[PDB]
Amino acid sequence: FPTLKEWVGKRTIQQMEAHGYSIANKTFEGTVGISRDDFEDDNLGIYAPIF
Amino acid sequence: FPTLKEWVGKRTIQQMEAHGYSIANKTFEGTVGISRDDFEDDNLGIYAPIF
Numbered sequence: 001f002p003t004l005k006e007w008v009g010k011r012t013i014q015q016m017e018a019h020g021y022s023i024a025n026k027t028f029e030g031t032v033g034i035s036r037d038d039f040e041d042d043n044l045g046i047y048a049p050i051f
Numbered sequence: 052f053p054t055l056k057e058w059v060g061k062r063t064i065q066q067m068e069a070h071g072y073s074i075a076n077k078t079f080e081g082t083v084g085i086s087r088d089d090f091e092d093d094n095l096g097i098y099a100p101i102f
Binding site for chain 1: 077078079080081082083084097098101
């Protein structure tokens with residue numbers, strides 16, 4: 001609200017202001033490729049924790 | 052009251068002083084106007100916190 005000012009004549013109508021702002025989303029990706037043979041020919045379990 | 056001076060002859064009649072000071076009252080005002088259309092058509096709530 002405007003700061004109060006001395007009342008000399010008749011009330012003066014004044015104006016306020018409104019603001020706006022927006023942020024747009026984005027998409028992200030990441031992928032890897034492990035061959036079927038190497039994944040299946042694995043007794044050690046070294047490749048197991050990829051998830 | 053006058054400081055006490057040494058008495059030698061007669062008594063000298065001094066005088067004092069009174070003081071005054073006044074502060075006058077002032078009138079302040081502030082006014083904001085929004086159209087009825089703009090107030091009722093607001094479906095967002097931006098103009099709600101004016102009071």
